[PDB]
Amino acid sequence: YYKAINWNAIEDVIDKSTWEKLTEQFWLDTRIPLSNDLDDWRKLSHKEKDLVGKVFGGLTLLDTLQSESGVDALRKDVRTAHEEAVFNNIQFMESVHAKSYSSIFSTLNTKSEIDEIFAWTNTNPYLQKKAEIINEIYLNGTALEKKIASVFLETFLFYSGFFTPLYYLGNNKLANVAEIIKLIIRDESVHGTYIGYKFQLAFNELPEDEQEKLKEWMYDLLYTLYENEEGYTESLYDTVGWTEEVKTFLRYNANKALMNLGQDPLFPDSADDVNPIVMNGIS
């Protein structure tokens, strides 16, 4: 009726290495001392403090989705018994990500200031409609179509927000707050590659006919999400004046979202076009 999981009889060699990489990257928000960033924080403007809350607020919401219904839908299309175990680690760390944003708020912000942020996220047109498209794919979509959405979310669209803490890290501002985002990106870079790898296995098993049919919907989704994100980026970054530098940051990460799935790069935006202080933050 049921079969036991065996880590001596490996079916896919990547399942072992990814578990050994994701578990050994385990981290908690309670360890990192956020109180050391308050000296830098209080020397920011209202414009900058407002931006930061809306950024981390947006990421909180998108990491909530992945922990609740994202990886829960992804586990249904699992090949090996080990892969379901690796998705269990992944799903836990998504809850860690979601929580870590609230821990960052508990240092920097007050009671009312937090209620403001969550009131904004729960009512935001861009975010609520973005989760509406992504969660439709998790409930209704196929095995290959869901794996495409998760990679497009966390390896591409999530970098709309990540831009800001990385920018501060380059200038040596808010070193500990960015340290949380650092560890999220350390996890999320492996989240994309593993899904992209498994996507690649089932994609090759699909016949020539149905591959191009999926690629058609792949790029349709990619364009509609970038369409929606451009308006969201303008809302955040206009008054500070980075609107165009975040756009050349999104297209750079779209290329990686393609590359993990096993595709040719669509945009010509290189790593040099990206802000060098942000790119120094990455390094």
Rounded least distance, CB 77 to a copy of itself, Å: 14
At residue 266, φ and ψ (nearest 5 deg) are -90, -45
- Residues 203-262 within binding reach of Mn ion (CB under 5 A): none
- Of 54, 82, 97, 147, the residue at the interface with Mn ion (CB under 5 A) is 97
Is residue 154 close enough to count as binding Mn ion by CB under 5 A? yes
Per DSSP, helices labelled H in the chain are 13-22, 38-41, 46-65, 71-74, 81-108, 111-123, 125-140, 143-152, 159-170, 175-205, 208-237, 243-261, 276-282
Helix axes 208-237, 143-152, angle to 10 degrees: 30
CB atoms within 10 A of CB 12: 16
Return the number of the residue (30 or 280) whose C-beta is nearest Mn ion. Answer: 30
Known binding residues are 63, 94, 97, 154, 188, 191
Q: Determine the Cα–Cα distance for residues 168 and 40; give it in Å rounded to an integer.
A: 10
Query: With binding defined as CB under 5 A, does residue 82 bind Mn ion?
Result: no
- Piece of 99-107, 190-198, 232-240, 255-263 that binds Mn ion (CB under 5 A): 190-198
User: Which of the ranges 73-81, 154-162, 205-213, 247-255 carries the binding residues for Mn ion, by CB under 5 A?
Assistant: 154-162
DSSP at 3: -
Q: Which of a copy of itself, Mn ion, none does residue 35 bind to, with CB < 5 to 8 Å depending on kind?
A: none
Separation between Cα atoms, residue 121 and residue 117, nearest integer Å? 6
List the x/- string, 101-140, binding to Mn ion by CB under 5 A: ----------------------------------------
- Single-letter code of the amino acid located at 233: T
Residue 3: contacted member of Mn ion, a copy of itself, none (CB under 5 to 8 Å, by partner type): a copy of itself
Q: How far is the CB of 190 from a copy of itself (least distance, A)?
A: 15
Overall size of the chain counted in residues: 283
Catalytic pick from 101, 126, 167, 194?
101
Give the rounded distance of the alpha carbon of 189 from its chain centre.
8
Residue 217 binding: pick among Mn ion, a copy of itself, none (C-beta 5-8 Å cut-off by kind): none
| Positions that interact with a copy of itself (CB under 8 A) | 1-9, 19-20, 23-24, 26, 28, 30, 57, 60-61, 64-65, 67-68, 72, 75, 81, 84-85, 88-89, 91-92, 94-96, 98-99, 102-103, 105-106, 111, 114-115, 118, 121-123, 128-129, 131-132, 135
Here the tokens at position 127 are 């975010």
Residues annotated within a binding site for Mn(2+): 63, 94, 154, 188
Please, which residue, 15 or 154, has the CB nearer to Mn ion?
154
One-character DSSP codes across 11-55 = S-HHHHHHHHHHSTT---TTTS-GGGGHHHHTTS-HHHHHHHHHH
- Cβ(138)–Cβ(146) under 8 Å? yes
Quick one: what does residue 154 bind among a copy of itself, Mn ion, none, with the CB cut-off 5 to 8 Å set by partner type? Mn ion
Respond yes or no: is residue 101 known to be catalytic: yes
For helices 208-237 and 125-140, the axis angle rounded to 10 degrees is: 160
Catalytic residues: 101
